[PDB]
């Protein structure tokens, strides 16, 4: 037991499989955010549905009661924390028009790409597996670290990484023992 594991299951299905009008639109998301498969396209769509209908359940209530502020602002606290929500869109009627791509801009795969460490959208997403990425104490293998807005000033390479110069091959350092030897 006890409490085995809560479901919280992602990989939300499409209600119609072979629509061309969604078929072209998903690959434009991969055309910029070159993700692993279509399930991760659901995964951020899975996320905003928690943001969509729950905030929509606030809108049917009136000003001014507690939960439209209490659950209201604490959403907006976290929504401006993650960095998709600016200061001009403060009220709850300004948050439902948030598109899916703003969360995609905050992704660790492309935040290192819009920063000058990666210089390509496919040279970006391969470095996270080999762990040449550090945030202030910690290296992260996970490409889905998706960063809060305060964590923009600190994202860079690792110290144990070959950049900037820790075991710089190290397989290439054995390679000079092969061709020169």
């Amino acid at each position: 037991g006890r409490i085995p594991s809560v479901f919280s299951k992602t990989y939300v299905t499409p209600r119609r499989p072979y629509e061309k009008a969604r078929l072209d639109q998903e690959l434009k998301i991969i055309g910029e955010y070159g993700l692993r498969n279509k399930r991760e396209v659901w995964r951020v769509k899975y996320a905003l549905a928690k943001i969509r209908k729950a905030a929509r359940e606030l809108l049917t209530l009136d000003e001014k009661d507690e939960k439209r502020l209490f659950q209201g602002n604490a959403l907006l606290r976290r929504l401006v924390r993650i960095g998709v929500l600016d200061e001009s869109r403060m009220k709850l009627d300004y948050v439902l028009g948030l598109k899916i791509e703003d969360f995609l801009e905050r992704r660790l795969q492309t935040q290192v790409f819009k920063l000058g460490l990666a210089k390509s959208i496919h040279h970006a997403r391969v470095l996270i597996r080999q762990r040449h990425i550090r945030v202030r104490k910690q290296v992260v293998n996970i490409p889905s670290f998706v960063v809060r807005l305060d964590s923009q000033k600190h994202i860079d390479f690792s110290l144990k990484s070959p950049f900037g110069g820790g075991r710089p091959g190290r397989v290439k350092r054995k390679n000079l023992k092969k061709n020169q030897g």
Binding site: L27, I30, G34, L35, R36, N37
Partner: peptide, 13 residues
């Protein structure tokens, strides 16, 4: 692989 399978889906498109 699949993400690389996604990469070619623009040069023909």
């Amino acid at each position: 692989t699949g993400r690389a399978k996604r990469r070619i889906q623009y040069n023909r498109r």
